[PDB]
Design a protein around this ligand. Structure first.
Ligand SMILES: Cc1cc2nc3c(=O)[nH]c(=O)nc-3n(C[C@H](O)[C@H](O)[C@H](O)COP(=O)(O)O)c2cc1C
Ligand SMILES: Cc1cc2nc3c(=O)[nH]c(=O)nc-3n(C[C@H](O)[C@H](O)[C@H](O)COP(=O)(O)O)c2cc1C
Ligand SMILES: O=C(O)c1[nH]c(=O)[nH]c(=O)c1CCc1ccc(F)c(F)c1
Ligand SMILES: O=C(O)c1[nH]c(=O)[nH]c(=O)c1CCc1ccc(F)c(F)c1
Lengths: 313, 313
């Protein structure tokens, strides 16, 4: 009947939103997401200062998904904060703001500024743990001590409920260690699984060439390639973090794919590649498709099946 | 025009072989592989003792690839060593023997006994590092200290050229660290990239159930899902290990997929999922298709294009 839900002290029309980085960089983008049928929107991950990002071409898409090395292009934190404090129409849907500083200190400085606006307006923070490569050290969410420092510092500085955008993991021990880090932080109220599958390489057979210019063609994978990885991550953290929400991201092209995310444990479902390729019309199609699968199955609510994926024996 | 290779002091009719675990567990399997048009074969990764593996269903395939948690079912090392010593017809094609002991000591025990057979008959060792060690620790090749220890102990015990089967990596830092570990070992003459993309989760929408029984449905991914990941790892190790060969594995269904692996740096090209699904006739098709692409492009030999992927600007 209707897909409306309540999370994090906000009401949402439906569980769909963009994935950070897609259709969310400019004021134009944000207004378009706000005008869409999505249940929420999230802004492009920002730095304290504006960034141009990497040389083009830096994104390409294919029948099975996408590759990107954007380089964190963004208008800077002051723009996104202004959008949250003065321009967003909260009557339309909730807003999440994604932050991706290049150091702990930069994150801290952004979150301290965000906190009053969060209190006054209700904007929600998604903290992105992924970053450009620094030779000699791993990405922050793949360095569990660094992750723990980031979260300790942001938690102290911010003081309010927030979420974290996670890269995928591929090892059960890693799921156990990551979730145990996150569970140390009561203010981490949602976990978004997943960011792009890192450092894939698409090659064009005719030209014998990589398809993006930065990083010798290496870039993060999204889309169909990554749905089983995304589901695995959603479910692993759903199981491990019973006091948190999990937001699913990765490989959603249809209401059926959303249904699978929700079965695995997702509360919100984010759409990246498929949104980039189809445009914001996609949200009406996803809603219709999800309601049709629910009706066929007899489900009246998302809660009836969230996390209820069945195991064998 | 030809697909011939000469490497590791062996001659190969073409670069294609099975991926370890597919069509290689029983004498019947190995005889089938030998009868096929493949350029080589590898035996099922073995332990000291026979294993039944995990409960079924433990492998499933779909249009975009496969998922498995087999549990290392195998006939034991003594069977594979007998096949290599007594049964295999080396006039037909070269044989690789894959080992996947559950501790460094089990590996050392096997390679000590393999050595004289390697020396006399020419069987080639593939050591599987994308394998469990202590539960609650990451797989061996995700634990760089453990990986170093396995390589030091097996190199001392074996004393002959061998290769290693690697899981995929997703972070530049890990490519750099892993390749640096491998480059400490002069006896590691080939590197096979990649094993399955770990701990994915396939869910069936109609039944609302995972599709394999072990590990609550979590298992390693193969097939179309993983081709960009496999190409990235092939190229990353090809660039970082200039004194070693790289063998490609992951997402090969066509001659074009194989051509992309070879442009990335692959010497041998291994076929898992697609061989599991299509059967050994696949090798004639892959040879025909790769030759057709070479004819269109005017390439007469594999070396004309191996490693020659172009980057932008
Ligand atoms: C062009 C592009 C830019 C992105 N930028 C960001 C970003 O700024 N912050 C972030 O958290 N994830 C970013 N991502 C990752 C996506 O949010 C999402 O995690 C990933 O694309 C997987 O979802 P999908 O399979 O729906 O594409 C970006 C993805 C794309 C394709
Ligand atoms: C049923 C099955 C069993 C496998 N068993 C092994 C194994 O014993 N040893 C190993 O190194 N890799 C094993 N693998 C991984 C494959 O060798 C290969 O690395 C992976 O399937 C990716 O290649 P693909 O995309 O062609 O399937 C197995 C894969 C499958 C599908
Ligand atoms: O802006 C990006 O390149 C980007 N793309 C993603 O798919 N996810 C992200 O989180 C980001 C921003 C952070 C980031 C910036 C540069 C990278 F090389 C990287 F892998 C991640
Ligand atoms: O026999 C297996 O499950 C297997 N499957 C693969 O796709 N690759 C492998 O190397 C193996 C053997 C090692 C292994 C054994 C148990 C696991 F849970 C696991 F992920 C890997």
């Amino acid at each position: 009947m209707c897909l409306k839900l309540n999370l994090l002290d906000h009401v949402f029309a439906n569980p769909f939103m963009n994935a950070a980085g897609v259709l969310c960089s400019t004021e134009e983008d944000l207004r378009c997401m706000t005008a869409s049928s999505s249940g929420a929107l999230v802004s492009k991950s920002c730095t304290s200062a504006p960034r141009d990002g990497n040389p083009e071409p830096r994104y390409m898409a294919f029948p099975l998904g996408s590759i990107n090395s954007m380089g964190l292009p963004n208008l800077g934190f002051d723009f996104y904060l202004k959008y949250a404090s003065d321009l967003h129409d909260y009557s339309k849907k909730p807003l999440f703001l994604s932050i991706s500083g290049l150091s702990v200190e930069e994150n801290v400085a952004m979150v301290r500024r965000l906190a009053p606006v969060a209190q006054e307006k209700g904007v929600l923070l998604e903290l992105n743990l992924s970053c450009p490569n620094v030779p000699g050290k791993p990405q922050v969410a793949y360095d569990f001590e660094a992750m723990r420092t980031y979260l300790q510092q942001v938690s102290l500085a911010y003081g309010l409920p927030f979420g974290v955008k996670m890269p995928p993991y591929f090892d059960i021990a890693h799921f156990d260690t990551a979730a145990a880090v996150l569970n140390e932080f009561p203010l981490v109220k949602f976990v978004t699984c997943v960011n792009s599958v890192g450092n894939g390489l698409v090659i064009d057979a005719e030209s014998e060439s990589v398809v993006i210019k930065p990083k010798q063609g290496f870039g993060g994978l999204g889309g169909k390639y990554i749905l089983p990885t995304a589901l695995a991550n959603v479910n692993a953290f759903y199981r491990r973090c019973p006091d948190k929400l999990v937001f699913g991201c990765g490989g959603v092209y249809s209401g059926e794919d959303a249904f699978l995310h929700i079965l695995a444990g997702a509360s919100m479902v984010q759409v990246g590649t498929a949104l980039q390729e189809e445009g914001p019309g996609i949200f009406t199609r996803l809603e219709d498709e999800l309601l049709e699968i629910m009706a066929r199955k007899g489900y009246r609510t998302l809660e009836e099946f969230r996390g209820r994926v069945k195991t064998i024996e």
